[PDB]
């Protein structure tokens, strides 16, 4: 409908796949080469389905900060025959607050879904499903089961992936440029 939705659509149309694990179907953001991200609660194993194709997992790393606290981001390298468009230049370098974000989801359940979530707070610490978690972004939208892995964007920046909610607020794990240096 406007420039926020434009940037979000551009990311969804080229940099997402549908990932299926034993724990469900997730929006999965491809960042560069064969490297993607997914919430750690997806429990990625040795094999994952990518757009309903059986795919070997070459590497999976559940990120933690240097306090050894959960960040809820798993970086996956996929044995796929095709590279993602490199979007690392759209990743923030530092922790920050944002105005006017969009949460975008693409699964069998919720195809072509875009949600204007408004102001995004650098929330920091969250007890996420009983797990102490750092680098959490918060938005005041009643997000639902099926939106985990959703991409959070502003115009020109990919800032996070949706990892949970409490019925009134939604929570995303930050993406930082420093996670994807190679």
PDB file of C-alpha atoms in Angstrom:
ATOM      1  CA  UNK A   1       0.000   0.000   0.000  1.00  0.00           C
ATOM      2  CA  UNK A   2       3.045   2.331   0.634  1.00  0.00           C
ATOM      3  CA  UNK A   3       6.925   2.339   0.678  1.00  0.00           C
ATOM      4  CA  UNK A   4       7.141   0.135   3.841  1.00  0.00           C
ATOM      5  CA  UNK A   5       5.038  -2.598   2.176  1.00  0.00           C
ATOM      6  CA  UNK A   6       7.142  -2.098  -1.012  1.00  0.00           C
ATOM      7  CA  UNK A   7      10.466  -2.888   0.783  1.00  0.00           C
ATOM      8  CA  UNK A   8       8.856  -5.828   2.669  1.00  0.00           C
ATOM      9  CA  UNK A   9       7.426  -7.338  -0.607  1.00  0.00           C
ATOM     10  CA  UNK A  10      10.836  -7.003  -2.319  1.00  0.00           C
ATOM     11  CA  UNK A  11      12.431  -9.061   0.508  1.00  0.00           C
ATOM     12  CA  UNK A  12       9.633 -11.668   0.582  1.00  0.00           C
ATOM     13  CA  UNK A  13       9.585 -12.200  -3.216  1.00  0.00           C
ATOM     14  CA  UNK A  14      13.325 -13.030  -3.487  1.00  0.00           C
ATOM     15  CA  UNK A  15      14.772 -13.800   0.019  1.00  0.00           C
ATOM     16  CA  UNK A  16      12.259 -16.232   1.653  1.00  0.00           C
ATOM     17  CA  UNK A  17      11.510 -19.966   1.469  1.00  0.00           C
ATOM     18  CA  UNK A  18       8.995 -22.113   3.360  1.00  0.00           C
ATOM     19  CA  UNK A  19      10.958 -24.250   5.857  1.00  0.00           C
ATOM     20  CA  UNK A  20       9.379 -27.354   7.449  1.00  0.00           C
ATOM     21  CA  UNK A  21      10.853 -29.166  10.482  1.00  0.00           C
ATOM     22  CA  UNK A  22       9.218 -31.724  12.832  1.00  0.00           C
ATOM     23  CA  UNK A  23       8.113 -28.660  14.925  1.00  0.00           C
ATOM     24  CA  UNK A  24       6.126 -27.016  12.026  1.00  0.00           C
ATOM     25  CA  UNK A  25       6.194 -24.759   8.917  1.00  0.00           C
ATOM     26  CA  UNK A  26       8.193 -21.480   9.249  1.00  0.00           C
ATOM     27  CA  UNK A  27       8.922 -18.407   7.153  1.00  0.00           C
ATOM     28  CA  UNK A  28      12.725 -18.636   6.563  1.00  0.00           C
ATOM     29  CA  UNK A  29      14.850 -15.607   5.521  1.00  0.00           C
ATOM     30  CA  UNK A  30      17.722 -16.309   3.110  1.00  0.00           C
ATOM     31  CA  UNK A  31      20.589 -13.813   3.765  1.00  0.00           C
ATOM     32  CA  UNK A  32      23.366 -14.701   1.229  1.00  0.00           C
ATOM     33  CA  UNK A  33      24.828 -17.721  -0.641  1.00  0.00           C
ATOM     34  CA  UNK A  34      23.051 -20.825   0.888  1.00  0.00           C
ATOM     35  CA  UNK A  35      22.802 -19.240   4.411  1.00  0.00           C
ATOM     36  CA  UNK A  36      19.389 -18.628   5.989  1.00  0.00           C
ATOM     37  CA  UNK A  37      17.920 -17.976   9.481  1.00  0.00           C
ATOM     38  CA  UNK A  38      15.030 -19.537  11.437  1.00  0.00           C
ATOM     39  CA  UNK A  39      13.902 -19.323  15.098  1.00  0.00           C
ATOM     40  CA  UNK A  40      15.908 -21.765  17.282  1.00  0.00           C
ATOM     41  CA  UNK A  41      12.637 -23.360  18.582  1.00  0.00           C
ATOM     42  CA  UNK A  42      12.181 -24.782  15.000  1.00  0.00           C
ATOM     43  CA  UNK A  43      14.764 -27.459  16.174  1.00  0.00           C
ATOM     44  CA  UNK A  44      16.579 -27.804  12.806  1.00  0.00           C
ATOM     45  CA  UNK A  45      18.087 -31.290  12.292  1.00  0.00           C
ATOM     46  CA  UNK A  46      20.257 -32.971   9.619  1.00  0.00           C
ATOM     47  CA  UNK A  47      17.373 -32.779   7.023  1.00  0.00           C
ATOM     48  CA  UNK A  48      14.839 -29.939   6.494  1.00  0.00           C
ATOM     49  CA  UNK A  49      12.103 -29.391   3.821  1.00  0.00           C
ATOM     50  CA  UNK A  50      12.588 -26.179   1.747  1.00  0.00           C
ATOM     51  CA  UNK A  51       9.527 -25.359  -0.474  1.00  0.00           C
ATOM     52  CA  UNK A  52       8.539 -29.096   0.047  1.00  0.00           C
ATOM     53  CA  UNK A  53      11.961 -30.383  -1.242  1.00  0.00           C
ATOM     54  CA  UNK A  54      14.038 -32.689   1.039  1.00  0.00           C
ATOM     55  CA  UNK A  55      17.275 -30.697   1.736  1.00  0.00           C
ATOM     56  CA  UNK A  56      20.455 -31.677   3.659  1.00  0.00           C
ATOM     57  CA  UNK A  57      21.548 -29.235   6.377  1.00  0.00           C
ATOM     58  CA  UNK A  58      25.321 -28.588   5.889  1.00  0.00           C
ATOM     59  CA  UNK A  59      25.611 -26.603   9.182  1.00  0.00           C
ATOM     60  CA  UNK A  60      23.215 -25.257  11.867  1.00  0.00           C
ATOM     61  CA  UNK A  61      24.313 -22.927  14.707  1.00  0.00           C
ATOM     62  CA  UNK A  62      21.998 -21.758  17.546  1.00  0.00           C
ATOM     63  CA  UNK A  63      23.396 -18.287  18.392  1.00  0.00           C
ATOM     64  CA  UNK A  64      24.053 -17.135  21.978  1.00  0.00           C
ATOM     65  CA  UNK A  65      25.549 -13.828  23.166  1.00  0.00           C
ATOM     66  CA  UNK A  66      28.865 -13.553  25.017  1.00  0.00           C
ATOM     67  CA  UNK A  67      26.910 -13.852  28.327  1.00  0.00           C
ATOM     68  CA  UNK A  68      26.040 -17.425  26.968  1.00  0.00           C
ATOM     69  CA  UNK A  69      22.373 -16.222  26.798  1.00  0.00           C
ATOM     70  CA  UNK A  70      19.981 -17.553  24.089  1.00  0.00           C
ATOM     71  CA  UNK A  71      19.414 -15.196  21.063  1.00  0.00           C
ATOM     72  CA  UNK A  72      16.693 -17.484  19.463  1.00  0.00           C
ATOM     73  CA  UNK A  73      18.384 -17.230  15.993  1.00  0.00           C
ATOM     74  CA  UNK A  74      19.644 -20.411  14.266  1.00  0.00           C
ATOM     75  CA  UNK A  75      21.852 -19.813  11.152  1.00  0.00           C
ATOM     76  CA  UNK A  76      21.409 -22.700   8.668  1.00  0.00           C
ATOM     77  CA  UNK A  77      23.580 -23.498   5.646  1.00  0.00           C
ATOM     78  CA  UNK A  78      21.414 -25.455   3.134  1.00  0.00           C
ATOM     79  CA  UNK A  79      22.637 -28.030   0.538  1.00  0.00           C
ATOM     80  CA  UNK A  80      20.608 -26.117  -2.108  1.00  0.00           C
ATOM     81  CA  UNK A  81      21.466 -25.769  -5.833  1.00  0.00           C
ATOM     82  CA  UNK A  82      20.744 -21.992  -5.871  1.00  0.00           C
ATOM     83  CA  UNK A  83      22.083 -18.920  -3.933  1.00  0.00           C
ATOM     84  CA  UNK A  84      19.998 -16.195  -2.276  1.00  0.00           C
ATOM     85  CA  UNK A  85      20.324 -12.567  -3.365  1.00  0.00           C
ATOM     86  CA  UNK A  86      22.875 -11.080  -0.916  1.00  0.00           C
ATOM     87  CA  UNK A  87      20.880  -8.760   1.452  1.00  0.00           C
ATOM     88  CA  UNK A  88      23.565  -8.325   4.185  1.00  0.00           C
ATOM     89  CA  UNK A  89      23.847  -4.565   3.346  1.00  0.00           C
ATOM     90  CA  UNK A  90      20.201  -4.183   4.624  1.00  0.00           C
ATOM     91  CA  UNK A  91      21.138  -5.528   8.122  1.00  0.00           C
ATOM     92  CA  UNK A  92      21.643  -3.071  11.036  1.00  0.00           C
ATOM     93  CA  UNK A  93      25.129  -2.920  12.622  1.00  0.00           C
ATOM     94  CA  UNK A  94      23.859  -2.084  16.161  1.00  0.00           C
ATOM     95  CA  UNK A  95      20.952  -2.677  18.594  1.00  0.00           C
ATOM     96  CA  UNK A  96      18.291   0.022  18.024  1.00  0.00           C
ATOM     97  CA  UNK A  97      14.639   1.140  18.231  1.00  0.00           C
ATOM     98  CA  UNK A  98      12.675   1.680  14.968  1.00  0.00           C
ATOM     99  CA  UNK A  99       9.575   3.464  13.662  1.00  0.00           C
ATOM    100  CA  UNK A 100       6.891   2.069  11.326  1.00  0.00           C
ATOM    101  CA  UNK A 101       7.892  -1.614  10.826  1.00  0.00           C
ATOM    102  CA  UNK A 102       6.149  -4.390   8.805  1.00  0.00           C
ATOM    103  CA  UNK A 103       6.040  -8.070   9.785  1.00  0.00           C
ATOM    104  CA  UNK A 104       5.810 -10.291   6.641  1.00  0.00           C
ATOM    105  CA  UNK A 105       4.932 -14.041   6.640  1.00  0.00           C
ATOM    106  CA  UNK A 106       4.693 -16.601   3.840  1.00  0.00           C
ATOM    107  CA  UNK A 107       3.524 -20.170   4.706  1.00  0.00           C
ATOM    108  CA  UNK A 108       0.885 -22.659   3.396  1.00  0.00           C
ATOM    109  CA  UNK A 109      -1.391 -21.316   6.252  1.00  0.00           C
ATOM    110  CA  UNK A 110      -0.590 -17.551   5.812  1.00  0.00           C
ATOM    111  CA  UNK A 111       0.487 -16.820   2.188  1.00  0.00           C
ATOM    112  CA  UNK A 112       1.414 -13.228   1.182  1.00  0.00           C
ATOM    113  CA  UNK A 113       0.700 -11.855   4.709  1.00  0.00           C
ATOM    114  CA  UNK A 114       1.913  -8.311   5.630  1.00  0.00           C
ATOM    115  CA  UNK A 115       1.182  -6.633   9.055  1.00  0.00           C
ATOM    116  CA  UNK A 116       1.974  -2.962   9.839  1.00  0.00           C
ATOM    117  CA  UNK A 117       3.137  -3.389  13.484  1.00  0.00           C
ATOM    118  CA  UNK A 118       4.144   0.289  14.115  1.00  0.00           C
ATOM    119  CA  UNK A 119       6.833   1.337  16.627  1.00  0.00           C
ATOM    120  CA  UNK A 120       9.519  -1.272  17.538  1.00  0.00           C
ATOM    121  CA  UNK A 121      11.169  -1.049  21.024  1.00  0.00           C
ATOM    122  CA  UNK A 122      14.657  -2.396  21.847  1.00  0.00           C
ATOM    123  CA  UNK A 123      13.100  -4.473  24.683  1.00  0.00           C
ATOM    124  CA  UNK A 124      16.304  -6.431  25.528  1.00  0.00           C
ATOM    125  CA  UNK A 125      15.681  -9.254  28.019  1.00  0.00           C
ATOM    126  CA  UNK A 126      12.654 -11.569  27.630  1.00  0.00           C
ATOM    127  CA  UNK A 127      11.770 -14.858  29.357  1.00  0.00           C
ATOM    128  CA  UNK A 128      10.677 -16.501  26.091  1.00  0.00           C
ATOM    129  CA  UNK A 129       8.805 -19.761  26.757  1.00  0.00           C
ATOM    130  CA  UNK A 130      10.822 -20.123  30.038  1.00  0.00           C
ATOM    131  CA  UNK A 131      14.175 -19.446  28.245  1.00  0.00           C
ATOM    132  CA  UNK A 132      16.126 -16.226  29.181  1.00  0.00           C
ATOM    133  CA  UNK A 133      16.642 -14.478  25.796  1.00  0.00           C
ATOM    134  CA  UNK A 134      18.524 -11.257  24.858  1.00  0.00           C
ATOM    135  CA  UNK A 135      18.333  -8.741  21.936  1.00  0.00           C
ATOM    136  CA  UNK A 136      14.494  -8.847  21.759  1.00  0.00           C
ATOM    137  CA  UNK A 137      12.518  -6.276  19.746  1.00  0.00           C
ATOM    138  CA  UNK A 138       8.878  -5.653  20.798  1.00  0.00           C
ATOM    139  CA  UNK A 139       5.841  -4.372  18.839  1.00  0.00           C
ATOM    140  CA  UNK A 140       2.247  -3.844  20.028  1.00  0.00           C
ATOM    141  CA  UNK A 141       0.421  -6.251  17.659  1.00  0.00           C
ATOM    142  CA  UNK A 142      -1.461  -9.446  18.689  1.00  0.00           C
ATOM    143  CA  UNK A 143       0.647 -11.905  16.643  1.00  0.00           C
ATOM    144  CA  UNK A 144      -0.442 -15.590  16.477  1.00  0.00           C
ATOM    145  CA  UNK A 145       0.893 -19.146  16.044  1.00  0.00           C
ATOM    146  CA  UNK A 146       2.078 -19.470  12.413  1.00  0.00           C
ATOM    147  CA  UNK A 147       3.953 -16.091  12.264  1.00  0.00           C
ATOM    148  CA  UNK A 148       7.279 -17.386  13.756  1.00  0.00           C
ATOM    149  CA  UNK A 149      10.141 -16.754  11.349  1.00  0.00           C
ATOM    150  CA  UNK A 150       8.239 -13.761   9.916  1.00  0.00           C
ATOM    151  CA  UNK A 151      10.514 -10.994   8.662  1.00  0.00           C
ATOM    152  CA  UNK A 152      10.527  -7.586  10.397  1.00  0.00           C
ATOM    153  CA  UNK A 153      11.545  -4.682   8.090  1.00  0.00           C
ATOM    154  CA  UNK A 154      11.573  -0.926   7.900  1.00  0.00           C
ATOM    155  CA  UNK A 155      12.176   0.987   4.624  1.00  0.00           C
ATOM    156  CA  UNK A 156      15.714  -0.029   3.702  1.00  0.00           C
ATOM    157  CA  UNK A 157      16.390  -2.355   6.743  1.00  0.00           C
ATOM    158  CA  UNK A 158      15.819  -6.038   7.660  1.00  0.00           C
ATOM    159  CA  UNK A 159      15.853  -5.795  11.468  1.00  0.00           C
ATOM    160  CA  UNK A 160      14.595  -9.110  12.955  1.00  0.00           C
ATOM    161  CA  UNK A 161      12.645 -12.387  12.761  1.00  0.00           C
ATOM    162  CA  UNK A 162       9.429 -12.972  14.756  1.00  0.00           C
ATOM    163  CA  UNK A 163       9.967 -15.531  17.623  1.00  0.00           C
ATOM    164  CA  UNK A 164       6.931 -15.148  19.952  1.00  0.00           C
ATOM    165  CA  UNK A 165       4.121 -13.153  21.552  1.00  0.00           C
ATOM    166  CA  UNK A 166       1.970 -12.808  24.721  1.00  0.00           C
ATOM    167  CA  UNK A 167      -1.444 -12.253  22.984  1.00  0.00           C
ATOM    168  CA  UNK A 168      -1.098  -8.371  23.029  1.00  0.00           C
ATOM    169  CA  UNK A 169       2.643  -7.877  22.087  1.00  0.00           C
ATOM    170  CA  UNK A 170       4.879  -9.607  19.495  1.00  0.00           C
ATOM    171  CA  UNK A 171       8.616 -10.240  19.901  1.00  0.00           C
ATOM    172  CA  UNK A 172      11.404 -10.540  17.311  1.00  0.00           C
ATOM    173  CA  UNK A 173      15.081 -11.583  17.604  1.00  0.00           C
ATOM    174  CA  UNK A 174      17.425  -8.906  16.219  1.00  0.00           C
ATOM    175  CA  UNK A 175      19.423  -9.520  13.058  1.00  0.00           C
ATOM    176  CA  UNK A 176      22.846  -7.840  13.136  1.00  0.00           C
ATOM    177  CA  UNK A 177      25.325  -7.557  10.238  1.00  0.00           C
ATOM    178  CA  UNK A 178      28.041  -9.132  12.514  1.00  0.00           C
ATOM    179  CA  UNK A 179      26.159 -12.502  12.570  1.00  0.00           C
ATOM    180  CA  UNK A 180      26.867 -13.008   8.772  1.00  0.00           C
ATOM    181  CA  UNK A 181      30.534 -12.056   8.264  1.00  0.00           C
ATOM    182  CA  UNK A 182      32.296 -14.883   6.273  1.00  0.00           C
TER     183      UNK A 182
END
